[PDB]
């Protein structure tokens, strides 16, 4: 199951709306929970959540000490849409002691902002250079290390410093040849169309996430005609795109431009009523 973007605040009630999601098509904001205690998060888990297409934001969630039980299999943050150029935001998470996103293999676009988390350790142990390309634009300041010593114990080492997420979880490292594709527990590369992980090697129907596009249970390089690229991660048909446009006619009224199903016509284009096709403006745009 693919779920839309979600903002969960005040109390954990609405969080169970994530129980069947394996992909969040949009962002995931979990914030402003002041009366939440660790007790509340004991048996709370979302093992199905594999991927976020936009960003993950966590702000002022009291009692949450780690993300290792909440999102144990979150493998990819696609970063299609970012929160001020960041795909991952951990801000003023007052009781967070570790990140623990031990399955996070790739942040496809955008940077990481981890700030003002006074109990947060296990950050120095994370080699982000294996998750992001744009590590230079990360902003990881004012955490427990900036004001104290973290007893970070862990395993792979890189320049030499050992890499881990928690006291009991190393950082997964695949052979250089495997690139971003992922690899099996035996070290065998996943198919060239996979991203982060897979259940079996050299099979694009055995991926956990796609390097490019998802179609019909497979990781494809491109959405072929008659399909359209949607949310920069999956292939959809004309009908799906049309039904989104009319569902919002009663939020965005979706259009067709350059083999994509997009929320709005680009600069200098207007929608030719009927076929959803973006046509260039004769003079100004209405």
């Amino acid at each position: 199951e693919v779920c839309p973007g979600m903002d969960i605040r005040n109390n954990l009630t609405r969080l169970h709306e994530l129980e069947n999601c394996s992909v969040i098509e949009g962002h995931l904001q979990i914030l402003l929970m002041f009366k939440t205690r660790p007790e509340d998060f004991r048996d709370l888990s979302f093992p199905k959540l594999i991927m976020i297409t936009d960003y993950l934001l966590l702000f002022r969630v009291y009692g949450l000490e780690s993300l290792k039980d909440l999102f144990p299999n979150l493998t990819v943050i696609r970063g299609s849409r970012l929160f001020f150029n960041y795909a991952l935001v951990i801000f003023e998470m007052v009781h967070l002691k570790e990140l623990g996103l031990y399955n996070l293999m790739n942040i496809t676009r955008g940077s990481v902002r981890i700030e003002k988390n006074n109990e947060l350790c296990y950050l120095a142990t994370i080699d982000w250079s294996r998750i992001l390309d744009s590590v230079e634009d990360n902003h990881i300041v004012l955490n427990k290390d900036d004001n104290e010593e973290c007893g970070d114990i862990c395993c792979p080492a890189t320049v030499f410093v050992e890499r881990c997420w928690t006291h009991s979880h190393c950082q997964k490292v695949c052979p250089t040849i495997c690139k971003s594709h992922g690899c099996t527990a035996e070290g065998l590369c996943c198919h060239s169309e996979c991203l982060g992980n897979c259940s079996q090697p050299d099979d694009p129907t055995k991926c956990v996430a796609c390097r490019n596009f998802y179609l019909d249970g497979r990781c494809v390089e491109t959405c072929p005609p008659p399909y359209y690229h949607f949310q920069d991660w999956r292939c959809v048909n004309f009908s799906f795109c049309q039904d989104l446009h009319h569902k919002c006619k009663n939020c965005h009224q979706y259009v067709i431009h350059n083999n994509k199903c997009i929320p709005e016509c680009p600069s200098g284009y207007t929608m030719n009523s009927s076929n959803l096709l973006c046509t260039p403006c004769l003079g100004p745009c209405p």
């Epitope: 169309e193 694009p204 129907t205 596009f213 179609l215 019909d216 249970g217 497979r218 494809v220 390089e221 491109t222 959405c223 072929p224 005609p225 008659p226 399909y227 690229h229 292939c235 350059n258 083999n259 994509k260």
Partner: antibody
Framework: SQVQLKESGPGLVAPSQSLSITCTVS????????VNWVRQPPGKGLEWLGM???????DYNSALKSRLSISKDNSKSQVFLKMNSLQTDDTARYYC????????????WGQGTSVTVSS | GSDIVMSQSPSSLVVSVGEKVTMSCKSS????????????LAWYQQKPGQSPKLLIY???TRESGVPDRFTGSGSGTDFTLTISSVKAEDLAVYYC????????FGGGTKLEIKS
């Protein structure tokens, strides 16, 4: 594990009749891959008949559309061809081939099945 | 709209072992996809009494196993297949195929080898 496709056909068909071929596939899901029907008359070139997408949608050769019918049964790993009102020009070897659509063109082919339209 | 037409030239070629071979393919419409800037064009090789074998896809990408002597080139509507040093095993019919919208095979170029 081995990707393979096998056609079953009539051998011999009388003119004005219908032809029925079954492609039984193995080693990949029919839900994620397309299957084409390509025929080849003796001594002549390859002619594409039609395709059946993972989602069950079908595309046909516009010149033959009126007489063609492709369907499948994912559970039985079978794709079916039905071509009506056969004439002697329909005498050909009929192949089924996997379509890794979005990534590759027809990669794995069956050994084909010879169909002779005779009076 | 209307169905894509594929043309191949020459219809037949006779060459000696060790010579270069060039065969052409023409498309009624551009096969260049604006999304990835790749051409939806493939080359197949059919040896006598065997089913067709994929050589090249995306106009120039070699299929796994295909020798480096086989070289696909071209963009839009005009495409070629080149065999740098033709071997005796290269006796086959070579077909180009468009896979942009539906599929269309070209007439084929019969490659014959001189003794």
């Amino acid at each position: 594990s081995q990707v393979q496709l096998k056609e079953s056909g009539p051998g011999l068909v009388a003119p004005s009749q219908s032809l029925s071929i079954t492609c039984t596939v193995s080693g990949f899901p029919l839900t994620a891959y397309g299957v084409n029907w390509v025929r080849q008359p003796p001594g002549k070139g390859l002619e594409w008949l039609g395709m059946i997408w993972g989602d069950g949608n079908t595309d046909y050769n516009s010149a033959l559309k009126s007489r063609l019918s492709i369907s499948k049964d994912n559970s039985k790993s079978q794709v079916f061809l039905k071509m009506n009102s056969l004439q002697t020009d329909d005498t050909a070897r009929y192949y089924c081939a996997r379509d890794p659509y979005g990534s590759k063109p027809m990669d794995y082919w069956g050994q084909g099945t010879s169909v002779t339209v005779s009076s | 709209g209307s169905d894509i037409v594929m043309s191949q030239s020459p219809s037949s070629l006779v060459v000696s072992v060790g010579e270069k071979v060039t065969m052409s393919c023409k498309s009624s419409q551009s096969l260049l996809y604006s999304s990835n800037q790749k051409n939806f064009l493939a080359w197949y090789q059919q040896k006598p009494g065997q089913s067709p074998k994929l050589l090249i896809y995306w106009a120039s990408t070699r299929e796994s196993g295909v020798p480096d002597r086989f070289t696909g080139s071209g963009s839009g509507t005009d495409f070629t297949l080149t065999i740098s040093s033709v071997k005796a095993e290269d006796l086959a019919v070579y077909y180009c195929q468009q896979y942009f919208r539906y599929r269309t095979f070209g007439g084929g170029t019969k490659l014959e080898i001189k003794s």
